């Protein structure tokens, strides 16, 4: 089932069916070129474009450089047959990758069946094909066959990376805009790609790579295919509809050319730059064009130039345009079907949806302009796959989009010179005599300022409410399930035939569709300014590579006037520390302190509880970009609290919402029904008005405000990168200043330091993204929406007055219902429709914020060991290798629980990927796992340290070892300097939370501060590891008892995880509560609570008591008896007796399955073991007093007494509750105890039901089930 059903090579001999020389439309005479038919109506011509446009028969650069950010020229590209074969295979591979996805499958299918309309006949009763939509294919015998087609993929023109859709036009018809459609020629190259900067994904992928990221070529092809799909159905937006920009201010760009068609093609937030008025305009325009096509098909009487029947062509176009055919065969356009088709072609065929489907990193908007050009090679499967692209699965490239990172996947991307040279199109910004200091600012580094006329509206135009006035439906955001709805109802069966048409002329005559004449925007415009701009602050933080020591400086002045001075917004103490000359012996500590200070200042966040919509503030944004004005960062914080987000904007945007058009109501005399319908329609149209103004404000916000915030965010990323690079340059100068002897004695890897500063910047960018997003949303909510809400309330007042007059005018007609209609009007119009941001923007759903947090935790795991299906595997994207020993025991009930014995064959080995093995001096990392350590019984375990988890290589790495009441974490560098942290639990204790119980261990390692060990989510100990050098961990992680002298010793372990960052306390608590399996009850040791298993009982209010039965029968009772006693082995353990007292057995009553696992809210029976035989726990609910004394009864003697027990699991999940219920479903109360004289009897009490969960008063009815375990092993 491939889209290309044949293996095509460029040296394959011509056959005239799918491989042949062809001639397409041309201005004059054209040399035939070899082309390949890869699918129906889909041809590929591996040739440079010198024929489609006669003005571009030259592959040399144009007279003036194109006003594009990135351009590349190579007249020698795609000349050799090897290059052409590579091109053909790459295009084939990209088509296969697109067709593999659901959305791409639909897109290609729609392209194939969108045959250009046969509108060439001057006579309305005939159907004649248009020549320019066809080609001539030369046959082996020398004759040529004219064939109609839909799409041709050819190589680029002079500019290699300028990809676009071309089509040959008509004398009078605009085929791409009248619904007809024309054959589309896409200029494309699969051997090159763009390189862009991204910082938004650090929230979910904090391990994002540094430097540029490379666009997946499949996305660019899909973009051009969507252009082709718009053009083939004749619904392409007019290329003179351009989003105008203001180019007069110093901060504004010199000029930008983007089309409404391009904005529609992009989708996402870019498509929302168009208001709803113009969208409805476009929809109705193309609707009437489709109706034109329908009427043309109707008045048709014959076909010309082919052997195919007229009815067949009518059917083909019926399926292309989804026309409705009535009982007489006449065609018409259904509004519903046209809606589906137009929405699918315009709103679903978007680059954003293809980004969602391809699972690749890509720019969220067109304003994230490309920055570099990279040579690639996608044909080899080791470099690029149909299903994964550059992000090859089960490799380092699969995680964090590292396949697209030009620095990590460097063998796949070779940087090329950008022919758009540095500062080719720019503005000259000068600061007045602080003579003039002037900087060139690149055009695409300036601010996008949309013009006001782009946001046209008729909000001030009134409407006439009729009883027939149509109420509109919703506008569902394009979600993935709607795409699936169209996918499941899509028809992939019919494909139009490649019919036989009458032969055209030898040379097809035709020219491209005329493009509007675009003016080159002004360049080099000089501005004379009184204040330093944000561009000056960002420029002052740059420098040139060289030998000379660059020095940091807090004076923007001094930095701007010296190449060897770099401005920094850090503290002056940082400047003094970095610029000082440091000796060799003090070099490593110097670098560590510099890293610590860099991370401290970049991660600085000031929480505010004084303003509503903003919760955090990053202060250094002030001096980083001169946001606002004033001296300190305290000015920035205070002015942000006082004024609001408005200080972050470079231009205050006009949010002009006029007086809303009032409704005029038509009067229907002596007619009750139509009058009440008019009233209802007026109210509904008022609701629609509320939604319309909200949508207009959201569009203005997305175009005018959010773009400025995005540019500020990009510039913050750039400033952080500049600071990091400057610090690295100074440190490496200092290192290189040394004699090479000192350079041998100091093991310094600057790439390691570059990494460390990279993730510090990633954290800083997480904070900056959150803060700036909050600022943009706050400005929308507080500074723009209220103008609306005011205008809307005024409209409500006007509508209320007009209605009330309308109702009192038809008082005779609405006889009796005057009061009800009056109340309806007054009550509906006295309320406000609240503005909900989740309704108009896809980003701001709360569930997505929760998902972002959980993903951020997940995506930091470089190793995640879980038991899936029938094997223990690595669920991380790296997918390391797992070798399971022959004597590794998995728990049959919970196969995640792994038992390791003191045997050589009871071992688990993890072969790590070469890109995730630890070898650094600065990279923090963490580990977490659940371990169950049995009690120690022998004195041979005293002072016997044995490793269980091993990642040591030549005495360097990390290990987890065990000793008598000791969990030990050991770090050791390559210099054999080692540090150990310990958690100690004593065996001389009544009841222990750690002995033979599941323990959640977490070890975090900050290479600059400390190694911390946490138990059950609480910090336990820490040791300073800042004095450790370079650590080289092992290529494999070994789980096995190593050196354990206790022959019968074993451990239990589950849910092992290795993370690439230092977890904070909150994250560790989240992990502890997440991995608790909160839906399942647990026994005392932490395992799964099971049916038909005997459990001794513990009461959490009085742990020193055990359940005993005074007498069997209805006249007897059960009570808590103490003390438990003590079991001991001298100098080893002295613990309370746990196996004392009566036993409970949980019996299945209403279980809908057979697994013997007690889940939450399970209705069960409970048996009591007395003298090694089972009775039933029950009570008489009709006895006086809320406290119902429980008793152990003979099983055949229970009768109709209260016995049904509802179980509850409260957080491990050790805390267990038992709510008793009679046979009528009523509550008897939770099972705890109550004092009767001396004896505390077991009692069902409804007083517990009256207490809030987790309250201290609920600790009396909290229970702990204790089964006999080999880890405890006292005498039963």
């Amino acid at each position, epitope marked *: 089932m491939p889209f290309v059903n044949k293996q095509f090579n460029y040296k394959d001999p011509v056959n005239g069916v799918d491989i042949a020389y062809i001639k397409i439309p041309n201005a004059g005479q054209m040399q035939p070129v070899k082309a390949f038919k890869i699918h129906n109506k889909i041809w590929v011509i591996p040739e440079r474009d010198t024929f489609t446009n006669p003005e571009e028969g030259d592959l040399n650069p144009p007279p003036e450089a194109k006003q594009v950010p990135v351009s590349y020229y190579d007249s020698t590209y795609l000349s050799t047959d090897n290059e052409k074969d590579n091109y053909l295979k790459g295009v084939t591979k990209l088509f296969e990758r697109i067709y593999s996805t659901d959305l791409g499958r639909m897109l290609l299918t729609s392209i194939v069946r969108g045959i250009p309309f046969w509108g060439g*006949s001057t006579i309305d009763t005939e159907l004649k094909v248009i020549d320019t939509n066809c080609i001539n294919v030369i046959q082996p015998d020398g004759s040529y066959r004219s064939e109609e087609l839909n799409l041709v993929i050819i190589g680029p023109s002079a500019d290699i990376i300028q990809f676009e859709c071309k089509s040959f036009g008509h004398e009078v018809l605009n085929l791409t805009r009248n619904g007809y459609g024309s054959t589309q020629y896409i200029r494309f190259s699969p051997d090159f790609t763009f390189g862009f900067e991204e910082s938004l994904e650090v929230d979910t992928n904090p391990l994002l790579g540094a430097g540029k990221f490379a666009t997946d070529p499949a996305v660019t092809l899909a973009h051009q295919l969507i252009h082709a799909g718009h053009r083939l159905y004749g619904i392409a937006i*007019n290329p003179n509809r351009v989003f105008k920009v203001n180019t007069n201010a110093y901060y504004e760009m010199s000029g930008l050319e983007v089309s409404f068609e391009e904005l529609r093609t992009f989708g996402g937030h870019d498509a929302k730059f168009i208001d709803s008025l113009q969208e409805n*305009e476009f929809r109705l325009y193309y609707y009437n064009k489709f109706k034109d096509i329908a009427s043309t098909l109707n008045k048709a009487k014959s076909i010309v130039g082919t052997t195919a029947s007229l009815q067949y062509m009518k059917n083909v176009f019926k399926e292309k345009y989804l026309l409705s055919e009535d009982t007489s065969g006449k065609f018409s356009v259904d509004k519903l079907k046209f809606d589906k088709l137009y929405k699918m072609l315009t709103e679903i065929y978007t680059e954003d949806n293809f980004v969602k489907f391809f699972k690749v990193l890509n720019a969220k908007t067109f304003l994230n302009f490309d920055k570099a050009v990279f040579k690639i090679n996608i044909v080899p499967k080791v470099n690029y796959t149909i299903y994964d692209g550059f992000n090859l699965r089960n490799t380092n490239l699969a995680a964090n989009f590292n396949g697209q990172n030009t620095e990590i996947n460097n063998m796949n991307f070779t940087k090329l010179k950008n022919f758009t040279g540095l500062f080719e199109f720019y503005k000259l910004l000068c600061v007045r005599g602080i003579n003039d200091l002037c900087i060139k600012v690149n055009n695409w580094d300036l601010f996008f300022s949309p013009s006001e006329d782009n946001f046209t509206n008729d909000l001030n135009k009134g409407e006439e409410i009729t009883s027939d006035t149509n109420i509109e439906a919703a506008e569902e955001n394009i979600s993935l399930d709607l795409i699936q709805q169209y996918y499941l109802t899509f028809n992939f069966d019919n494909e139009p035939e490649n019919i036989s048409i009458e032969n055209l002329s030898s040379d097809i005559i035709g020219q491209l569709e005329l493009m509007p004449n675009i003016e080159r925007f002004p360049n080099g415009k000089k501005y004379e300014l009184d204040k330093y701009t944000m561009f000056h602050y960002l420029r002052a933080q740059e420098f040139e590579h060289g030998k000379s020591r660059i020095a940091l400086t807090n004076s923007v002045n001094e930095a701007l006037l010296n190449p060897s001075r770099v401005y920094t917004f850090f503290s002056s103490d940082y400047v003094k520390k970095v610029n000082k000359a440091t000796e060799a012996a003090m070099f490593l500590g110097w670098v560590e302190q510099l890293v610590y200070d860099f991370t401290d200042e970049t991660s600085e966040v000031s929480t505010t509880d004084k303003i509503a919509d903003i919760t955090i503030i990053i202060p250094y944004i002030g001096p980083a970009l001169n946001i606002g004005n004033m001296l300190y960062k305290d000015d920035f914080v205070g002015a942000l609290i006082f004024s609001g987000a408005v200080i972050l904007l470079e231009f205050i945007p006009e949010i002009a919402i006029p007086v809303l058009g009032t409704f005029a109501l038509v009067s229907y005399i002596a007619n009750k029904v139509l009058t009440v319908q008019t009233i209802d329609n007026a109210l509904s149209k008022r609701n629609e008005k509320w939604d319309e103004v909200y949508k207009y404000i959201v569009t203005n916000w997305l175009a005018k405000v959010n773009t400025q915030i995005d540019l500020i965010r990009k510039k913050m990323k750039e400033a952080l990168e500049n600071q990091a690079e400057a610090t690295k340059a100074i440190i490496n100068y200092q290192y290189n200043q040394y004699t090479e002897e000192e350079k041998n004695n100091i093991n310094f890897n600057i790439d390691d330091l570059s990494s460390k500063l990279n993730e510090s910047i990633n954290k800083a960018m997480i904070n900056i993204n959150k803060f700036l997003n909050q600022c943009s949303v706050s400005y929308l909510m507080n500074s723009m929406i209220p103008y609306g809400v005011k205008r809307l309330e005024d409209f409500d007042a006007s509508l209320k007055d007009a209605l009330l007059k309308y109702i009192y005018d038809n008082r005779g007609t609405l006889i009796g219902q005057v009061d009800r209609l009056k109340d309806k009007v007054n009550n509906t119009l006295s309320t406000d429709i609240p503005f909900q941001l989740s309704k108009y923007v896809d980003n701001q759903r709360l569930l997505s914020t929760f998902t972002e947090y959980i993903k951020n935790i997940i995506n930091t795991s470089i190793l995640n060991l879980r038991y899936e299906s029938n094997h223990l595997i690595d669920l991380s994207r790296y997918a390391s290798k797992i070798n399971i020993g022959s004597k590794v025991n998995f728990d049959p009930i919970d196969k995640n629980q792994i038992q390791l014995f003191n045997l050589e064959s009871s071992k688990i080995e993890v072969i790590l990927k070469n890109a995730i093995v630890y070898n650094s001096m600065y990279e923090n990392f963490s580990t977490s796992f659940w371990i169950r350590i049995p009690k120690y019984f022998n004195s041979i375990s005293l002072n016997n340290e044995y490793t269980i988890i091993n990642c040591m290589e030549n005495n360097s790495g990390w290990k987890v070892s065990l000793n008598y009441g000791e969990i030990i974490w050991t770090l050791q560098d390559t210099q054999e300097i080692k540090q150990r942290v310990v958690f100690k639990y004593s065996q001389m204790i009544n009841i222990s939370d750690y002995i033979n119980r599941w323990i959640f261990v977490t070890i975090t390692n900050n290479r600059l501060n400390n190694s911390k060990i946490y138990i059950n989510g609480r910090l336990i100990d820490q040791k300073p590891i800042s004095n450790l050098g370079n650590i080289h961990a092992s290529n494999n992680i070994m789980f096995k008892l190593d050196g354990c002298r206790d022959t019968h010793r074993y451990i239990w372990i589950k849910y092992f995880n290795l993370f690439d960052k230092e977890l904070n306390e909150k994250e560790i608590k989240d992990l502890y509560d997440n991995q608790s399996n909160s839906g399942i009850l647990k026994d005392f040791w932490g395992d799964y609570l099971q049916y038909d298993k005997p459990y001794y009982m513990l009461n959490l209010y009085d742990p020193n008591k055990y359940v005993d039965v005074n007498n069997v029968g209805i006249r007897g009772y059960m009570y808590l008896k103490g003390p438990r006693g003590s079991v001991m082995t001298t100098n080893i353990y002295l613990n309370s007796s746990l196996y004392r007292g009566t036993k409970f057995i949980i019996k299945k009553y209403a279980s809908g399955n057979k697994d013997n696992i007690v889940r939450n809210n399970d209705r069960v029976y409970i048996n009591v073991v007395v003298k090694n035989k089972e009775y039933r726990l029950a009570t008489n609910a009709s006895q006086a007093g809320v406290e119902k004394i429980l008793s152990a009864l003979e099983i055949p003697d229970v009768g109709n007494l209260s016995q049904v027990v509802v179980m509850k699991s409260k957080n491990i999940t050790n805390k267990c509750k038992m709510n008793l219920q009679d046979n009528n479903g009523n509550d008897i109360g939770f099972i705890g105890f109550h004092q009767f004289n001396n004896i505390a009897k077991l009692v069902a009490s409804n007083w517990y039901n009256r207490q809030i969960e987790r309250s201290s008063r609920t600790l009396g009815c909290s229970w702990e089930f204790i089964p006999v375990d080999d880890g405890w092993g006292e005498r039963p």
Partner: nanobody
Framework: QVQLVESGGGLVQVGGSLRLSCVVS????????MGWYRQAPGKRREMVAD???????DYAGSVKGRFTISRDNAKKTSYLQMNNVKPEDTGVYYC????????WGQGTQVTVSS
């Protein structure tokens, strides 16, 4: 119900000028595109010009540079100014409102005489 009424058609000499107008009743025609088509004797009714509510224009090949389409949303009227007319411009001109329906006018005859 929506109604389109055209006016201003007559016979015109080669190179002369003629102004066609069309008024709308029953709809505000704000945010709604408009167009002028012409039907030659024996040929299909063909697009001549289109104008959007924002004022953007889209012309055919044989008519560009000689005809100018304008509109007034306030007066709910579409205009087509025909300058430097040629014998191919003879036919019945129809106005169209690209709205919720196939809103057409009655049609007015333009004959270029020489």
């Amino acid at each position: 119900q929506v109604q389109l009424v055209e006016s201003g058609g007559g016979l015109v000499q080669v190179g002369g000028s003629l102004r066609l107008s069309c008024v709308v009743s029953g709809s505000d025609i704000s945010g709604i595109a408009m167009g002028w088509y012409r039907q030659a004797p024996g040929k299909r009714r063909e697009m001549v010009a289109d104008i959007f509510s924002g004022g953007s224009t889209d012309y055919a090949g044989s008519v560009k540079g000689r005809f100018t389409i304008s509109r007034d949303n306030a007066k709910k009227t579409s205009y087509l100014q025909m300058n430097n007319v040629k014998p191919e411009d003879t036919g019945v001109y129809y106005c169209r409102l690209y709205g919720s329906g196939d809103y057409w006018g009655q049609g007015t005859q333009v004959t270029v005489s020489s």
